[PDB]
Ligand binder design. Structure first.
Ligand SMILES: Nc1ncnc2c1ncn2[C@@H]1O[C@H](CSCC[C@H](N)C(=O)O)[C@@H](O)[C@H]1O
Ligand SMILES: [Zn+2]
Ligand SMILES: [Zn+2]
Ligand SMILES: [Zn+2]
Length: 232
């Protein structure tokens, strides 16, 4: 029923009042890039102004950085035209955070989303395996209901329980329309959501959770798909 746009989360005090009434999810620390709890160029021919003006993608699907799921930096041959700097430029798709029937809050497209469209980066606190297991028990002790863990690399798990952005609201489906992709940005790995098919406006954005924390009971899955696994 209730819904809200990405920008409603910039203002903290207005947010806590909307949350106090149930028109926005509960407060968390909004951040722009991953926070660690313990701390070359491509070959694309630069585009001329004509081909720029008439609609040519700079650093298209044949870009060497894009192929290795590396993002270009400042020094790219196309400079400002580079379409391969989506994480750094926060070129996120238009999405809204909405109340679902029983999964809690969720993400839905506010515009049509073509296939293999960048949706959002999944930000949060990065933990090693020791910190991760520490919080799994802190969160079972606090009877948390929603969990916000995302596998990044060996000895790196992303935890958006406390700090993150609106990507933390994407819910599970056994028949998803999104996936995670790991991208290198300045020598460092981040993960983001990408649509795996055309998502029509209004439709809820979902991906297929593949995380193992386990023990503390299992959660039933309300995705409502034809072939639902039954649980998360
Ligand atoms: N398909 C599904 N069925 C039941 N619960 C789901 C679900 N997908 C996501 N969830 C819930 O959402 C949590 C993941 S975090 C996703 C955002 C969450 N819906 C929220 O309001 O904050 C899970 O721990 C689970 O509680
Ligand atoms: Zn390139
Ligand atoms: Zn580039
Ligand atoms: Zn399901």
């Amino acid at each position: 029923g209730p819904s809200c746009v990405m920008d409603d989360f910039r203002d903290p005090q207005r947010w806590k009042e909307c949350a106090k009434q149930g028109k926005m999810p509960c407060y968390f620390d909004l951040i722009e890039e991953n926070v660690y709890l313990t701390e070359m160029q491509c070959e694309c021919t630069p585009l001329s102004k004509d081909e720029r003006a008439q609609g040519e993608i700079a650093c298209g699907e044949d870009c060497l950085n894009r192929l290795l799921m590396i993002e270009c930096s400042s020094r790219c041959p196309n400079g400002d035209y580079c379409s391969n700097r989506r994480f750094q430029r926060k070129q996120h798709a238009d999405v809204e955070v909405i109340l679902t029937e029983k999964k809690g809050w969720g993400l839905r497209a506010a515009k049509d989303l073509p296939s293999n469209t960048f949706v959002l980066e999944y930000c949060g606190e990065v933990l090693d395996h020791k910190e991760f297991k520490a919080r799994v028990k802190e969160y079972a002790r606090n009877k948390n209901i929603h969990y916000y863990f995302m596998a990044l690399k060996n000895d790196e798990i992303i935890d958006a329980t406390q700090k993150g952005n609106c990507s933390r609201f994407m819910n599970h489906s056994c028949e998803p329309n999104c996936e995670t992709q790991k991208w290198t940005v300045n020598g460092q790995l981040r993960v983001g959501f990408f649509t795996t098919k055309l998502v029509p406006s209004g439709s809820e954005l979902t991906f297929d959770y593949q995380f193992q924390r386990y023990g503390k009971e299992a959660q039933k899955c309300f995705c409502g798909s034809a072939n639902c696994r039954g649980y998360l």
